[PDB]
């Protein structure tokens, strides 16, 4: 099991779930490089929704991908995954808000 | 000088959109930092439009987020882009 | 005269910090249905002029 | 304004940048300048240094060295390096 | 450079690049001695001390001698427990420095703060 | 002995700071301030300034490093350990752990000769 | 006498206001202030006011420079003897 | 805030609370002000490990808010369950399905939004001043007059 290079800012999520998101996120950026952040965001939310036993309930999966963004969100307990991929240098925010 | 924002993508009531651009000019002058701006918007919008709410303040970003109907609004001030929604 | 270090500077003492064990219940409820976290990605900037 | 001599180079003593990123940086310029000269082919050695910073440290470094210039720039916390060597003054800041 | 030769008189300093060099040294040691991330019993507190003694010597080895080393290690269990470990040392500006590194596992967190002060 | 380091004096300085932030004392929980995520960030900056100012007042020619560890309502096996590479007959360091209602806080003080 | 410039500014979609104010400010900034550092403080401050922040400009009589910028925001012109360089990044 | 005298009339120095590693100043562009704004004063206080963690006590102010959120979500589910159970004859809809049944296409639209980002680009500019040529001239009284004549 390999895991591509990444920087965690805040991970309030189980390790099993986080690892499974990063792998997809790396492959998904590698598919359409110099591609729009919403195109990568759309396909990433589809994956995490589509995969069974990934659902923690309450809100609905919603992913924000940027190079420069601050924020403040209300999310479900142990469901928020922030990370920044080192080769791409693009932060990825993924969570469920009730 | 800071001229009034311009709403790109929006689903708000004629009364509400005014209250959003209101809170937007107050927030931008009070706090310098990009996270501190967001943090004000939400907590003000937790008094007027019920517990659940979310706010982002990005110079360059992109997304798709699931929002309650009539409780979404995206306004771009001069060279800064603020996205807020509900649940 | 001026400031020189010929005097041995080697010796080392430790001390042991801790806290006192309490009750398991603690009368507190784990986590909140929702949770509020304000995540920046931008790095704090500072300007310096050099000529 | 008060300069200082460390690792055979004349840097602004209060080291704006972290002292590891600064040491490795100055040493690479001195080992770049031992090969390519500033007088002849001075554009090349800047582009060599710029790419080097992006490899070992965070990306989008700006590199500015000259015998005479004056700049006011916005940079990140502890990501500003300004040092003289012989007569030539090397500025660079991460974004 | 008379002002430079003067500067050596007032304070010899011997400013050995204290920040990231130590931060790299402590990081390399912590990973190896943490061993099992899962292990945070009550009998590992005594073992977490042993870690701290070893630490301070390797600070001496890593090109410090003339400096005066004081290290504080903190080893704790996390259960989404919100705590902030801040510090602030009264010293000579640009004449001393600090080194900090924090290692966060799944179930355990270990932070190592190292204070060095110049003496003549 | 005008200058010199003393165990008691340092402990007294930290007590005053912990009291100055939220301790009327007097042997009764007259106040109760449970640990917010907002107030924690403020308290640290407040405590540390007050401790230094406290040490400063009686201060000799000793440098002073102070670290503030807070803990959210215990329930989590924490163990702090301190070692100082410093000549004995010169300096000594101390830590003092406090048990203030909901919030739990450990304060450390290093002493260095000048 | 500014024989060779490099103009990489938008021009199209009435953004000539953001190229012309490079040549216009430079001339007013240089003659008055007459100090390399203080020029780079004036031109930057103006371009931030009008076209939003994260502009870096460097003014020198003789200098080398390689840099990363935002496409169609970088202009390099000689104002008289002096050689002014300004560009956006972030 | 004290000063050390150094033995044998050395230059006096002192020891300041301020941490040196912390940046000198911190500058954060205001949009209202519309110009960069520098803050010489800094918090100058170093934190090794910060941790903000969900963990609340019985009868907080922050708990009461969390309870209200549950009670509102519950009330909406209860109404939505009861109304679907009242409208339909002997309804066997599970409470999980009723929630999924509460989130509609005309009660939770799902918009995508990005900002227009310019592509980054790395360029070189070398400025070399005009060449400077040595000139040697001699002037004597005759050479002046010779031209003059």
Author numbering:
A (entry chain L): 14 to 111
B (entry chain M): 1 to 87
C (entry chain E): 12 to 62
D (entry chain J): 16 to 110
E (entry chain O): 13 to 132
F (entry chain N): 4 to 117
G (entry chain K): 4 to 93
H (entry chain D): 61 to 209
Sentences from the paper on this structure:
Thousands of outer-arm dyneins (OADs) are arrayed in the axoneme to drive a rhythmic ciliary beat. Each OAD is divided into two regions, a head that contains AAA+ rings (rings) for ATP hydrolysis and a tail that holds together the whole complex. The tail is permanently attached to the MTD A-tubule, while the head region of each HC contains a microtubule-binding domain (MTBD), which binds and releases the MTD B-tubule depending on the nucleotide states. We reconstituted the purified OADs onto MTDs to mimic native arrays and determined the structures, by cryo-EM, of free OAD and OAD arrays bound to MTDs (OAD-MTD) in two different microtubule-binding states.
Cryo-EM classification reveals that the OAD arrays adopt two distinct microtubule-binding states, MTBS-1 and MTBS-2. In both states, the relative axial positions for α- and γ-MTBD are fixed on MTD (γ-MTBD is always 8 nm ahead), while the β-MTBD position is equivalent to either α-MTBD in MTBS-1 or γ-MTBD in MTBS-2. The OAD unit together with the four binding protofilaments (OAD-PF) was locally refined to resolutions of ~2.8–3.8 Å for most structured regions in MTBS-1 and to resolutions of ~3.8–6 Å in MTBS-2. The arrayed OADs adopt a fully parallel conformation in which the three AAA+ rings are stacked together via linker–ring (LR) interactions. In MTBS-1, β-HC adopts a post-1 linker docking mode, which is precisely switched to post-2 along with β-MTBD stepping forward. On the other hand, α-linker fits well into a groove (groove-1) formed by AAA3S, AAA5E and β-CT-cap in MTBS-1, while β-linker matches another groove (groove-2) between γ-AAA2S and γ-AAA3S. In brief, γ-Ig-PT contacts β-AAA4L PS-I with the help of γ-kelch in MTBS-1, while the contact site is switched to the H2-β3 loop of β-AAA3L in MTBS-2. The TTH interfaces involve IC3, NDD and α/β-HB1–3 of the OAD0 tail region, and α/β-linkers, AAA2 small subunit of β-HC (β-AAA2S), β-AAA6S and the C-terminal cap of β-HC (β-CT-cap) of the OAD+1 head region. In post-1, OADs are attached to B-tubules and form ordered arrays. The TTH interactions between OAD0 and OAD+1 sterically restrain the nucleotide-induced allosteric response of OAD+1 and its downstream neighbors.
